[PDB]
Amino acid sequence: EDWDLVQTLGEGAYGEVQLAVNRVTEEAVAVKIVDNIKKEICINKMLNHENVVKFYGHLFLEYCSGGELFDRIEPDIGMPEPDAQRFFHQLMAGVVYLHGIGITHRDIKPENLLLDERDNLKISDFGLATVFRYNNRERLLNKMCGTLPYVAPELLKRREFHAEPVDVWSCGIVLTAMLAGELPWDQPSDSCQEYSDWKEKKTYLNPWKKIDSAPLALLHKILVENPSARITIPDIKKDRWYNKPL
Numbered sequence: 001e002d003w004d005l006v007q008t009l010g011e012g013a014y015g016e017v018q019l020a021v022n023r024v025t026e027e028a029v030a031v032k033i034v035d036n037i038k039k040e041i042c043i044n045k046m047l048n049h050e051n052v053v054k055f056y057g058h059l060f061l062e063y064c065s066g067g068e069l070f071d072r073i074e075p076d077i078g079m080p081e082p083d084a085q086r087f088f089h090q091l092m093a094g095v096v097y098l099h100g101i102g103i104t105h106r107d108i109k110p111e112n113l114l115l116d117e118r119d120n121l122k123i124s125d126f127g128l129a130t131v132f133r134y135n136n137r138e139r140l141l142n143k144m145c146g147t148l149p150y151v152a153p154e155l156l157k158r159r160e161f162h163a164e165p166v167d168v169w170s171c172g173i174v175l176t177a178m179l180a181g182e183l184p185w186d187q188p189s190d191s192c193q194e195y196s197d198w199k200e201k202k203t204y205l206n207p208w209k210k211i212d213s214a215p216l217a218l219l220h221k222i223l224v225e226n227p228s229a230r231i232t233i234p235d236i237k238k239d240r241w242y243n244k245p246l
């Protein structure tokens, strides 16, 4: 049970992450080194799912030899549609799970989506995650959080908003990234030309031009500005592209 620090896997944020191999058993794990932290550990303790980075102790986290999904996205091209769909199915299984136990990640992006040895996707980094349901009671969010290109529009213009649609929106931006190798906009504000174009349905422009019509139909349903109108996860599960054999 005396781990060794073999190499640095990741850097940035308070601390840096390293690969830790057990001396005896030789189990490989990852260590996040930070000197906010109390909640991440708290939240991690609740998490048990095959599409969420496992929490071992304290941080000691499941090791993903696959790397970041981000590094499976060729710039300006994306990836083969079948891979995108499989990654999206798993991204959805993971989110359904978090929402089921009343947790929102709040920072979904390809940098926070890891892959294991069988290319299984793992939601990682709950440092920004928070509780949005407790005792069957929903709490609206009010703190602005995340990463501008993945963030939903309501987060920028409403004092308070629901947690789930914010996560749905960001999953859509990820899907866009997977099928086009580019992010549609710097942020979903009106001042942003690229977001205004999308609202006006100018889909002949990039990145939408690069996306087949079936997936794009789903992106039209996810990237809806009104969070009340935005598609929910159970309805994403019934979507034709989502259910298209590939």
Ligand SMILES: CC(=O)Nc1nc2c(s1)C(=O)NCCC2
Pocket (backbone or CB within 6 Å): 009, 010, 017, 029, 030, 053, 061, 062, 063, 064, 065, 066, 067, 068, 114, 124, 125
């Ligand atoms: C490139 C890479 O492997 N980055 C990683 N960051 C982490 C990795 S891998 C990990 O294995 N587990 C939990 C999150 C920290």
